[PDB]
Write a protein that holds these residues in place. Sequence first.
Motif, PDB file in Angstrom:
ATOM      1  N   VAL A  89      53.772  23.275  37.057  1.00 33.94           N
ATOM      2  CA  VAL A  89      52.541  23.475  37.816  1.00 33.94           C
ATOM      3  C   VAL A  89      51.648  24.419  36.990  1.00 33.94           C
ATOM      4  O   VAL A  89      51.977  25.589  36.840  1.00 33.94           O
ATOM      5  N   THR A 135      59.300  24.532  39.643  1.00 26.93           N
ATOM      6  CA  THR A 135      60.163  24.615  40.812  1.00 26.93           C
ATOM      7  C   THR A 135      61.464  23.814  40.640  1.00 26.93           C
ATOM      8  O   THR A 135      61.523  22.817  39.925  1.00 26.93           O
ATOM      9  N   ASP A 183      46.551  25.491  39.043  1.00 24.80           N
ATOM     10  CA  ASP A 183      46.975  24.858  40.291  1.00 24.80           C
ATOM     11  C   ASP A 183      47.848  25.775  41.148  1.00 24.80           C
ATOM     12  O   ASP A 183      48.237  25.389  42.246  1.00 24.80           O
ATOM     13  N   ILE A 184      48.178  26.969  40.649  1.00 28.30           N
ATOM     14  CA  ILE A 184      49.033  27.884  41.403  1.00 28.30           C
ATOM     15  C   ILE A 184      48.329  28.510  42.597  1.00 28.30           C
ATOM     16  O   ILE A 184      47.270  29.108  42.450  1.00 28.30           O
ATOM     17  N   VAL A 185      48.933  28.396  43.778  1.00 26.03           N
ATOM     18  CA  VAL A 185      48.387  29.027  44.976  1.00 26.03           C
ATOM     19  C   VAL A 185      49.133  30.324  45.189  1.00 26.03           C
ATOM     20  O   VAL A 185      50.355  30.308  45.308  1.00 26.03           O
ATOM     21  N   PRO A 201      50.570  23.984  52.520  1.00 26.31           N
ATOM     22  CA  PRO A 201      51.900  23.529  52.965  1.00 26.31           C
ATOM     23  C   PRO A 201      53.070  24.255  52.260  1.00 26.31           C
ATOM     24  O   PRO A 201      54.199  24.154  52.729  1.00 26.31           O
ATOM     25  N   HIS A 202      52.820  24.953  51.156  1.00 28.39           N
ATOM     26  CA  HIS A 202      53.921  25.514  50.339  1.00 28.39           C
ATOM     27  C   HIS A 202      54.851  26.496  51.042  1.00 28.39           C
ATOM     28  O   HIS A 202      54.408  27.320  51.819  1.00 28.39           O
ATOM     29  N   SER A 203      56.146  26.414  50.742  1.00 26.49           N
ATOM     30  CA  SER A 203      57.123  27.318  51.341  1.00 26.49           C
ATOM     31  C   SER A 203      57.150  28.695  50.700  1.00 26.49           C
ATOM     32  O   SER A 203      57.522  29.678  51.342  1.00 26.49           O
ATOM     33  N   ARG A 204      56.813  28.764  49.419  1.00 22.81           N
ATOM     34  CA  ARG A 204      56.872  30.032  48.698  1.00 22.81           C
ATOM     35  C   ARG A 204      55.601  30.276  47.883  1.00 22.81           C
ATOM     36  O   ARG A 204      55.013  29.352  47.342  1.00 22.81           O
ATOM     37  N   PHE A 205      55.186  31.536  47.806  1.00 19.26           N
ATOM     38  CA  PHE A 205      53.964  31.893  47.083  1.00 19.26           C
ATOM     39  C   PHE A 205      54.219  33.014  46.101  1.00 19.26           C
ATOM     40  O   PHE A 205      54.735  34.057  46.487  1.00 19.26           O
ATOM     41  N   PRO A 206      53.842  32.804  44.827  1.00 23.53           N
ATOM     42  CA  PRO A 206      53.782  33.896  43.860  1.00 23.53           C
ATOM     43  C   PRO A 206      52.825  34.952  44.383  1.00 23.53           C
ATOM     44  O   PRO A 206      51.820  34.617  45.015  1.00 23.53           O
ATOM     45  N   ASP A 208      60.845  20.260  41.678  1.00 20.85           N
ATOM     46  CA  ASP A 208      60.241  19.438  40.643  1.00 20.85           C
ATOM     47  C   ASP A 208      61.243  19.089  39.563  1.00 20.85           C
ATOM     48  O   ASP A 208      61.198  18.009  38.985  1.00 20.85           O
ATOM     49  N   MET A 251      61.915  28.935  42.171  1.00 12.74           N
ATOM     50  CA  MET A 251      60.680  28.984  41.396  1.00 12.74           C
ATOM     51  C   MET A 251      60.830  29.910  40.178  1.00 12.74           C
ATOM     52  O   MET A 251      61.362  31.007  40.300  1.00 12.74           O
TER      53      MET A 251
HETATM   54  N1  LIG Z   1      52.749  28.358  45.557  1.00 11.31           N
HETATM   55  C1  LIG Z   1      52.563  27.147  44.965  1.00 11.31           C
HETATM   56  N2  LIG Z   1      51.462  26.886  44.236  1.00 11.31           N
HETATM   57  C2  LIG Z   1      51.262  25.684  43.648  1.00 11.31           C
HETATM   58  N3  LIG Z   1      52.125  24.653  43.732  1.00 11.31           N
HETATM   59  C3  LIG Z   1      53.269  24.785  44.433  1.00 11.31           C
HETATM   60  C4  LIG Z   1      53.554  26.059  45.101  1.00 11.31           C
HETATM   61  N4  LIG Z   1      54.727  25.910  45.745  1.00 11.31           N
HETATM   62  C5  LIG Z   1      55.147  24.648  45.493  1.00 11.31           C
HETATM   63  N5  LIG Z   1      54.281  23.972  44.712  1.00 11.31           N
HETATM   64  C6  LIG Z   1      54.416  22.553  44.268  1.00 11.31           C
HETATM   65  O1  LIG Z   1      54.639  21.755  45.445  1.00 11.31           O
HETATM   66  C7  LIG Z   1      55.945  21.157  45.418  1.00 11.31           C
HETATM   67  C8  LIG Z   1      56.603  21.178  46.799  1.00 11.31           C
HETATM   68  O2  LIG Z   1      56.795  22.526  47.242  1.00 11.31           O
HETATM   69  P1  LIG Z   1      56.658  22.876  48.801  1.00 11.31           P
HETATM   70  O3  LIG Z   1      55.190  22.579  49.023  1.00 11.31           O
HETATM   71  O4  LIG Z   1      57.004  24.326  49.005  1.00 11.31           O
HETATM   72  O5  LIG Z   1      57.623  21.903  49.434  1.00 11.31           O
HETATM   73  C9  LIG Z   1      56.711  21.978  44.385  1.00 11.31           C
HETATM   74  O6  LIG Z   1      57.811  21.257  43.798  1.00 11.31           O
HETATM   75  C10 LIG Z   1      55.625  22.310  43.385  1.00 11.31           C
HETATM   76  O7  LIG Z   1      55.357  21.104  42.667  1.00 11.31           O
END
Ligand SMILES: Nc1ncnc2c1ncn2[C@@H]1O[C@H](COP(=O)(O)O)[C@@H](O)[C@H]1O
Length: 125
Positions: free
Chosen positions: A7, A112, A11-13, A32-37, A115, A97
């Motif tokens: 990623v 991830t 594109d990093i959120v 929708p992401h489960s984890r955030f940097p 991925d 991650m």
């Molecule tokens: N914080 C993030 N920022 C950008 N891309 C992400 C992030 N978390 C997950 N992803 C991407 O979205 C996919 C699914 O993650 P999740 O949305 O948490 O199920 C991951 O395998 C990454 O490709």
Amino acid sequence: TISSLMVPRSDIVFLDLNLPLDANLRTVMQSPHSRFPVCRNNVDDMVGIISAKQLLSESIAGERLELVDLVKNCNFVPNSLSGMELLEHFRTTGSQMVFVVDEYGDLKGLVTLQDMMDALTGEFF
Ligand SMILES: Nc1ncnc2c1ncn2[C@@H]1O[C@H](COP(=O)(O)O)[C@@H](O)[C@H]1O
């Protein structure tokens, strides 16, 4: 070829510890992401990673909440890692991650486990 599973940094959120708790909450709610940097000011000052479920859990909980308290450790790896080497790093650490840096030590993106597994069980290799 580890770049293609990445990623990209654009594109990093991410969450910013220098921003108000409410702004980070909104960032989380709009994704929708489960984890955030989590960083300070910008992504080149990464402090770690946050679970959305925990943040929201403890927010809906109504408890006295400071973002920095939920940060968990983040691992960095060189962009010179091979696919196998990266895979083994995931298995060894049990990380969901990992952050990838170039030769200047600058952040290039993140990988991830998800991925990584999709690429193994698809037609990537
Ligand atoms: N914080 C993030 N920022 C950008 N891309 C992400 C992030 N978390 C997950 N992803 C991407 O979205 C996919 C699914 O993650 P999740 O949305 O948490 O199920 C991951 O395998 C990454 O490709």
